[PDB]
Amino acid sequence: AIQLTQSPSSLSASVGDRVTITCRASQGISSHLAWYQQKPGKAPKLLIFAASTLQSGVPSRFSGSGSGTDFTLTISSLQPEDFATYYCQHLNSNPPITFGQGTRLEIKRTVAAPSVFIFPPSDEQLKSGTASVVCLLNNFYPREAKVQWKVDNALQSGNSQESVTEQDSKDSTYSLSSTLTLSKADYEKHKVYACEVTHQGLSSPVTKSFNRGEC
Amino acid sequence: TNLCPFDEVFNATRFASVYAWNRKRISNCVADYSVLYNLAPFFTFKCYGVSPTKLNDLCFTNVYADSFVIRGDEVRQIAPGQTGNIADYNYKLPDDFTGCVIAWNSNKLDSKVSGNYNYLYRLFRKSNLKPFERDISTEIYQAGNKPCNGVAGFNCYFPLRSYSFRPTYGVGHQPYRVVVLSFELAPATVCGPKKS
Amino acid sequence: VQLVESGGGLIQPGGSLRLSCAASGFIVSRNYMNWVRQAPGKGLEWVALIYSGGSTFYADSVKGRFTISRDNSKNTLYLQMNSLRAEDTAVYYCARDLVVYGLDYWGQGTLVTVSSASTKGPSVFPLAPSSGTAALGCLVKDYFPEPVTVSWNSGALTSGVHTFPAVLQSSGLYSLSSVVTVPSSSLGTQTYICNVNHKPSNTKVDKRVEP
């Protein structure tokens, strides 16, 4: 049936900027269109319906614009919390309702380098049969950060496994979690366990390390 | 035996909104359909419980011509045993319907470029319509347990919507005048030419 | 005011499952109600629709296997799912529909995850802080399927916490890790413990974090 396409797919913008997302329909539908906001891990929230009118309970910096076959959501005074994925919908009177594929809106901010931390396994865990070292990079920007595990200054690959948060609603900062996983055999074969963070907000790669069976 | 005022139903000025459909009663006349040759050539024509060309050679007690405007993509619901907001809250044919359905594009007739907000359909209704039932009320629809009584508000919705017929639209969205002939078989008073 | 749903989880391929979403502020027997699903990290996909007068409609991808019901008495809407193929894995949302005015109220989500794999509770291991602001937390290893719920002091500690997206180890098992930054001046007096609920296996587990 009708087809809805949003542009752009991804989008980065700085607080206070006027941002415009667009929704294009492959058929002129008069003003039967709704805009939805979906913050991560949450249901979507209706912002705009009738393609221009503002739903109740929604901030006024949301311009419902467009008509005919091309529409734009314009947020004017961009805000940190307004990081979400933005969807448009065909408000059709007949069943098969369709949404756009969505736009991911990422906030831009100033460089902030990560607090680094490192957590040797638990004797609890060691009693099981594997061990799990864990490095952590807290509250930084931008996403792009290099984490290098070193084990007696020998670099490890393959057993690492990173993981990132969603940009923060309050401050727009990511946090990262690396996890080196070795059997207790390979674990006791080494003494120094280090984690070396290279980031743009750091002038020199920070390291945080411990020693097996110490402190 | 005289002719039937079909041309008076089609060549008729304008049609009712689907929710409040017209029904002209027909009795004492002859079923000649070549009258309809001339119009926007009236292309969509399907019958149920009766065969085409067996019509000029049949007789029924009473005959009804229901008329209304709907948008094109919704014409598939004017048929027995359909669902959709039209087949359910505006105009329902019975499952055993015997009769014919006729529909022509009226984009040239009922589309203002400013938008024709005169054609209306019921959007909100508690229950389905019984076949050949008409709901005219514009009572405020109570979507919550909290009663509405006049105020259009949250969980208090007025139940009709304009069709907004614009000539630009993709053809699914364009107006269609529709006439539904109900063939009901008392002494018979509506027959075809081959029985005059 | 509210729409609250329940009934998803792990289930084999070909199996069957019945979601249910219950309503506050409006009777479902009076409104157009929808089930919309969202595949993991994919977009939105409409799935079923029930009219106030009971007429149902389905997306082809689910036609003839799903059946969207309701119960006027309990004021609740259902979604019975049979012949469950594996592609059906997603978050399932119910929603109230005001057709021309949009879907104004939504549920919270329930995750139907359809895999031939076997449920498996996690295990929790502490992350003792570095003996300014000293960070500490919990690890949660080798469980299935998603998700797990993680709280710090049963909802007390909420600022500066970050819980990480589960990663899928080569062992086909998830493992994630929650952390918080607290003042260095509280690590010996204040007692910190994370709470892990894993509904899919009935695995509720608490464990303290000490230097």
Residue numbers in the entry:
A (entry chain L): 1 to 215
B (entry chain R): 333 to 517, 520 to 530
C (entry chain H): 2 to 132, 138 to 217
The authors write:
To confirm these points, we further performed the X-ray crystal structure analysis of NCV2SG48 Fab in a complex with the Delta and Omicron S-RBD. The results showed that the binding angle between the RBD and Fab changed by BA.1 mutations, although the position of interaction was the same as that of the Wuhan RBD. The NCV2SG48 HC binding interface area was equivalent between Wuhan-Hu-1 and Omicron BA.1, while the LC binding interface area was reduced by about 22%. The overall Fab binding interface area was reduced by about 7%. The reduced binding interface area between NCV2SG48 LC and Omicron RBD could be explained by generated conformational conflict between NCV2SG48 and Omicron RBD at the mutated position, N501Y and Q498R, in Omicron RBD. The differences between the Cα atoms of each component of the RBD-NCV2SG48Fab complexes were less than 1 Å between Wuhan-Hu-1 and Omicron, indicating that their structures were highly conserved. These facts suggest that the steric hindrance caused by the bulky amino acid mutation of Omicron RBD (especially N501Y and Q498R) pushed up LC and weakened the RBD-Fab interaction. The extension of RBD binding residues by NCV2SG48 accounts for 79.2% of conserved amino acid residues in Omicron BA. RBD (19 out of 24 residues) that presumably contributed to the resistance to heavy mutations. In contrast, the potency of NCV2SG48 class 1 antibody showed only a 13.5-fold reduction to Omicron BA.1 to D614G, indicating that targeting of conserved residues with numerous hydrogen bonds could lead to neutralization breadth and resilience to antigenic shift associated with viral evolution even in the RBM-specific class 1 mAb.
The antigenic drift of the SARS-CoV-2 RNA virus causes immune evasion through the accumulated mutations in the spike (S) protein, especially in the receptor binding domain (RBD), which reduces the effectiveness of antibodies elicited by vaccination or viral infection. Fifteen of them are accumulated in the receptor-binding domain (RBD) which is a primary target of neutralizing antibodies produced after infection or vaccination, including nine mutations located in the receptor-binding motif (RBM), an RBD subdomain that interacts directly with the host receptor ACE27. Here, we analyzed broadly neutralizing antibodies isolated from long-term hospitalized convalescent patients of early SARS-CoV-2 strains. From the structure analysis, we found that both antibodies differently recognize RBM close to each other to inhibit ACE2-binding.
